[PDB]
Write a protein that binds this ligand. Sequence first.
Ligand SMILES: [Zn+2]
Lengths: 283, 41, 216, 246, 353
Amino acid sequence: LVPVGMAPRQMRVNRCIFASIVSFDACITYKSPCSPDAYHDDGWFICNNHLIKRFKMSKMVLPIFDNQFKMTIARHLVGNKERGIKRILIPSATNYQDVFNLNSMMQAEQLIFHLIYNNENAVNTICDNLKYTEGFTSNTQRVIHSVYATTKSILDTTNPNTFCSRVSRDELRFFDVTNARALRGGAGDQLFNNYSGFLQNLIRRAVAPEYLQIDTEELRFRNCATCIIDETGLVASVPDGPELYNPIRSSDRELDRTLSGYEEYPTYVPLFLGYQIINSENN
Amino acid sequence: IIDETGLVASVPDGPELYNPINRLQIRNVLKFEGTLSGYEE
Amino acid sequence: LINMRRYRNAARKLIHHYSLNSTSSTEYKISDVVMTMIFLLRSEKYHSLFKLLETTFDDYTCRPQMTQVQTDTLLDAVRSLLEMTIDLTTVDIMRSSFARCFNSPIMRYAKIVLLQNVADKRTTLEELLIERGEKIQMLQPQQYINSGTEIPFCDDAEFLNRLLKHIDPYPLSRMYYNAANTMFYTTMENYAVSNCKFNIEDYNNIFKVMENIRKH
Amino acid sequence: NKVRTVTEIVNSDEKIQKTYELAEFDLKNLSSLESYETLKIKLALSKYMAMLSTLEMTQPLLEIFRNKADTRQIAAVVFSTLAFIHNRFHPLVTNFTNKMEFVVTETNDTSIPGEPILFTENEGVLLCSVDRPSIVKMLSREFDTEALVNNCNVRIAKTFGASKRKDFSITEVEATQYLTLLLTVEHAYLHYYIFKNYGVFEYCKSLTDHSLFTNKLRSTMSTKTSNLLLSKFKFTIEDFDKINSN
Amino acid sequence: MECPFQIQVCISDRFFAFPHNLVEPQSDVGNKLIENLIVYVPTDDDRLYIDKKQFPKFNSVLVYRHEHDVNIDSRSPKKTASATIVYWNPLVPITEIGAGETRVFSVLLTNNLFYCNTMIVHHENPKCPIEFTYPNLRPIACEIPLSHFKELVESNDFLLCFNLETSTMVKILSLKRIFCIFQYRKQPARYVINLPHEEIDNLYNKLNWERTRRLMKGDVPSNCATVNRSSLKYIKQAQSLLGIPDYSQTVVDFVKMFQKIIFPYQLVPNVIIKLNNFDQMVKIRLFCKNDSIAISSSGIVPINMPDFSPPNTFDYSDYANRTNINFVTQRVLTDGGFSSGITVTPVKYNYYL
Ligand SMILES: [Zn+2]
């Protein structure tokens, strides 16, 4: 054979977990929609398409600096008039089963969710049902094992670093309302702890802090919090009052004569919440 | 068998009836070129 | 004293060329032949090969007679020199080539020749065809596959790209040259061993055919 | 050679004439064709290596051919190469229909010079004869990985125009081995094609003289099929005329 | 490297926690004890684990992070007769000394202290931890083990983490302290070091050299060793080939499995041979009580004799010759119908056949 004995090769890797979704019915061909962003080796382990579809969230970059550091950040896709469950940007382990319609989506994605959210009972139930469903032995068993192995590999990559970050001294993050004189913030740190390691990593990659103390310099990106966290999870709600207007101009004459080529401020609502602290740059 | 559970491929009693059922590979290569065959089944 | 290392290197290169064990082609000269013979003489290890080649200075149209021990010693020496495998057929090929070189006169130009005088009766391609085909038909298929089947094409496009990258720095010109000369020299050896005339004309007709198909 | 162009305004007679030397465009075209052909050949070679890997044989190619005992792998490799060439000529074909037999000769009195791979029917099905010793000898012959191979004006122009860029066990040596095997199997496949489509007598005549290949193949090959691998270069025997006179 | 005799170094695994009781005021030339104490620590955070109230003998206590003073040659550090100087787990050369004898307590024994004249080594009964390389673990900020002390002494599955900018010496000291804590654990604890393999190998090499220094200073041998990554990979391959679940079988027990072969067959297990080779890249010999001979990688050897017998002990010319070798090889090739992959070697013999 061509390749050296073993010698693990090096190539790109699709990173979004949902890329592994495939129809257990081998006789039914299926292709999941993945944004090309999935092939960027970055902190994101979900592609733009899955992110928008499932969490109502869009990625975004925040320049930081002399040396222009780029901090990852997500933004709301939640409209102004959405209410209740619609406001759950990222459901908690106690609500994801309901927020996400497990019945309406594929069994493989349901397993993916019950893996991300640490639901061993549901994972085992799905595994046993697939064992006793369809031609499990022929190829469905191997497909299920492949999907499970991929998800577990991603989770094993993430969780150790997540735990090290949790116990880390140099880098500290606090997901709550920096306005301690507020009631919608609560024990945001406790809820973040309740979240899974991979979910915690996603939250870190998505929600930027309201303030950021680097060594001795503090940068205040907001005088307010654009999202909150409660038992339900990450909620796209204004902690103090009326919801922020989210036009959603895309995706799902004299005025212009004056307003020809002309700097325009985006109407997007980025995610700003909590306090972050760091020593040195570590970049 | 028919019962409340529905239609079952079970027997009225006793044990169940016996009911049995290209990508060229290295193993697909056959070796050197070289018993009731005459009766129906 | 002498630079036994340089002598050895020249000897090895000349022996490779004269045994057709290397597609590499380069200039050679009486200086190189002298290098080789002096190295062989000086080396206790290779005295037998030195004796073999020295015998070529005579009529050289003769088959040396050696004991099995002598033949084994000679083959071991040659194999250690070229670090490979080998055969007494290669031994005879070297003997004939070196005899032709030694007998050849000093000339202002290199002499281009073909392998010959290897292993008495001249046989034609037709006779070889008949005899070999009869023996082959006598032989029985060691293994076989069934009808149909399916060519096992690869699928991993990433794997293909990795291989392409790995092979990009390889010059197709050099690879083609090496492969063609390998095949040509192996055919030459087969013909010479069989004592059947090599049809240079048909061997070149192969490329003539290639060109005639290409032009259309 | 050369050309020239004239610009002129409709209402005016002041015309501007420029001259162009076509050698530049000739260089462009030649470089483009050379690059395209190199890419095609390297793609084919990589595909061949990849399918052989797909067969998933532990040993490398030369070790496989040296292991006389494991005739299974030798037959598998030979058939896979033959089918690959067959498809390269008939892309719509992915199998070989009639089953195939294989035998691995082991002696000179069993091998035929100049045709290490050959074919003969047992009056019911075709058998492929393999000269494993000859295959091993070819793939073991030391290769030159150093020397280069080759109008000086266009040579210099290409030198100054074209650019250069400064975990597989494959070296140029192994690539050369694969190419040699492919070419040998291609020759054998041409023989077999002439056999199947023109009778055993024509096959024997081709073996005697390959020149018949010209018509017997170009009737179909040059028109419908990918050109022969050898087509990449014009080959010739050094001192061919004097050798013939000899 | 030279050290000033005025420094006295005590090495003890216990020193993973500061030995407050052992501190004592030093006397000057006038035999006047110094009521001022200065404690030096490798990192600022260490200060929090020094209880000033535990120094009744002294009237003033200060704690500082020892830092390499490039302006002072360690060969002759400056003296401060005004205070008694104690260093805890120093990582950089001591450039300052106190009245009388400057005291040092360390779980590590680096070269800096290796040449130190006064070396007091505390001995402990070994108690080894469990290497549990695997992607319910309890993360531990290795830089501050004493913070996790309760978990370290209670749980048994730890994920050892480090800050990105942590220094190599800091890492080494943290690992040594954690291993001391495990040495005092009644139940061995599994751990996973969240670091690159090469970094872990270097850390293990340095720890091994430290243990070697302690032995040379008179420390008691401890079987609680560590395994290089290549050796671990080889052991994993062996276990997989034998069909042994990695999580089920521990490396120590896996190796011990062949002690049944070591003596009775008077052969060195191949696993031990490979482990020794890995360590060498980073020969074997042994015997039994009252045994007259030693089992070695080379075979049987008379006790205390060299690993190889005199060259002329045995004549192999009869078969150790090209003729015999070629004859045997050709016979094998013919009988087996082979063409390659065959290799015959004459068998040499040590002291005994
Ligand atoms: Zn995706």
